[PDB]
Amino acid sequence: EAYWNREQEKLNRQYNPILSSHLNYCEPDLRVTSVVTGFNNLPDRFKDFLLYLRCRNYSLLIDQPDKCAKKPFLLLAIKSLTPHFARRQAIRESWGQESQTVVRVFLLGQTPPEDNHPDLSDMLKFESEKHQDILMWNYRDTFFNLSLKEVLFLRWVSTSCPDTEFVFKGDDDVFVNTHHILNYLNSLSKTKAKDLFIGDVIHNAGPHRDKKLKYYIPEVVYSGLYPPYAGGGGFLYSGHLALRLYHITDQVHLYPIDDVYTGMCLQKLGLVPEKHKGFRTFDIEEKNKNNICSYVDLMLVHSRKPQEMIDIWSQLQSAHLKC
């Protein structure tokens, strides 16, 4: 009934013999206009999504292929948009500092002028030259194309960083305690460090049908419920699981919600994402965030301004005293 479910099951047939072009088809799949009931009255983001669902062979316009010239213990992969210079620089100065080696990339798509974005291209290459932590692909960086950002990143991992022990993918408006990250990565059996995937996992969740919510998905697009999935701003996982994640992506259609898509891929691998206390997608204790020790035990809080990130990191450096 729902278009995505019907297309995914068609994909399931060709990958699963016991049930007996979606990857590089980059002209509009016009059949959607006649097969999706109500196509021309959907929001534009749904139209472009359905029209170009079967295109994912996009290329890197800016790469740092040497970012992993030393087997990293932690790859920091931060989603960002072109104009977010303040968010990126505060991460660079605070928790996203490179260092058990820690390495940092920012994952960007394109904000092109035909879509009326301001031309910030020359300041980005200037930023890319100085800091050399910018990965940009040649696809339109939009809300419903974030599954592309995830698949293209996992491809980059498998091509240019397959060694990294662990990976963190997150937003550029979240504070993460990377010191307490490296400490969690070591209360870690060499067994659990194999299939690691933790975040704020949401279960039994379903698509929102309110036309005016941001995570709205109409019934002509998706039916049923969502798999378990770690949402809310960032998750942590092992590199071994990242390589397996990339190779399964070909067997799952892109979904407009990037975190739901990552859960759909994990479930296809036979995995359940592990919830964790320290993933505070909904901020910290009753507006009492001005004590630094509440940040010493968590892994990330959402959300923080650039100024806030630097100040928290600055105070965290002395928190081994005051606590």
Ligand X SMILES: *[C@@H]1O[C@H](CO)[C@@H](O[C@@H]2O[C@H](CO)[C@@H](O)[C@H](O)[C@H]2NC(C)=O)[C@H](O)[C@H]1NC(C)=O
Ligand Y SMILES: C[C@H](NC(=O)c1ccc2[nH]c(=O)n([C@H](C)C(C)(C)C)c2c1)c1ccc(Br)cn1
Distance (Å, whole) CA 77 – CA 169: 5
Least distance in angstroms from the C-beta of 294 to ligand Y: 22
The pattern of x and - marking residues 15 through 54 that bind ligand Y according to CB under 6 A reads: ----------------------------------------
- Name the segment binding a second copy (CB under 8 A); options: 40-48, 144-152, 266-274, 308-316: 308-316
The binder of 240, among ligand Y, ligand X, a second copy, none, by C-beta within 5 to 8 A per type, is none
Q: Does 62 bind a second copy (CB under 8 A)?
A: no
DSSP line for 154-177: HHHHHHH-TT-SEEEEE-TTEEE-
Task: CB nearer to ligand Y: give 80 or 249.
Answer: 80
* Exposure b/e, 109-122, CB count within 10 A at least 16 = b: bbbeeeeebeeeee
Task: CB nearer to a second copy: give 37 or 307.
Answer: 307
Angle subtended by helix axes 85-93 and 121-131, to nearest 10: 10
The binder of 80, among a second copy, ligand Y, ligand X, none, by C-beta within 5 to 8 A per type, is ligand Y
Q: Check whether the bond before 187 is cis (ω within 30° of 0).
A: no
* Interstrand relation of 197-202 and 274-275 (parallel, antiparallel or unpaired): parallel
Chosen residue from 24, 34, 116, 290 binding a second copy by CB under 8 A: 116
**Tokens, residue 276:** 């964790």
Q: Three-state DSSP class for 85? A: helix
Task: CB nearer to a second copy: give 69 or 123.
Answer: 123
The binder of 314, among ligand Y, a second copy, ligand X, none, by C-beta within 5 to 8 A per type, is a second copy
The pattern of x and - marking residues 172 through 211 that bind ligand Y according to CB under 6 A reads: xx--------------------------------------
Chosen residue from 34, 40, 118, 190 binding a second copy by CB under 8 A: 118
Q: Does 81 bind ligand Y (CB under 6 A)?
A: yes
Q: Does 214 bind ligand Y (CB under 6 A)?
A: yes
Residue pair 201/273 in contact (Cβ under 8 Å)? The answer is yes
The binder of 17, among a second copy, ligand Y, ligand X, none, by C-beta within 5 to 8 A per type, is none
To which residue do tokens 């994909």 refer?
Answer: 11
Q: Does 313 bind ligand X (CB under 6 A)?
A: no
Q: Give the footprint of ligand Y on residues 299-318 (CB under 6 A).
A: none
Distance (Å, whole) CA 299 – CA 95: 11
- What DSSP element (H or E) covers 150? helix 146-160
**Closest alpha carbon to 229 in 206, 263, 200:** 263
> Would you tell me how many other CB atoms lie within 10 Å of the CB of residue 252?
20
Q: Does 153 bind ligand X (CB under 6 A)?
A: no
> Would you tell me how many other CB atoms lie within 10 Å of the CB of residue 1?
10
- Name the segment binding a second copy (CB under 8 A); options: 30-38, 68-76, 115-123, 292-300: 115-123
CA 72 to chain CA centroid, Å, is 19
Q: Does 310 bind a second copy (CB under 8 A)?
A: yes
The residues, ordered by sequence, that sit 6+ positions from 120 with a Cβ below 8 Å of its Cβ are 82, 83, 111
The residues of the shown chain that bind a second copy, judged by CB under 8 A, are: 82-83, 85-86, 89-90, 92-93, 115-120, 122-123, 126-127, 130, 306-308, 310-311, 314
Residues forming the site for ligand Y (CB under 6 A): 79-81, 141-143, 146, 149, 171-173, 214
Name the site residues for ligand X (rule: CB under 6 A): 24, 26, 45, 48-49, 52, 55, 57-58, 139-140, 142, 144-145
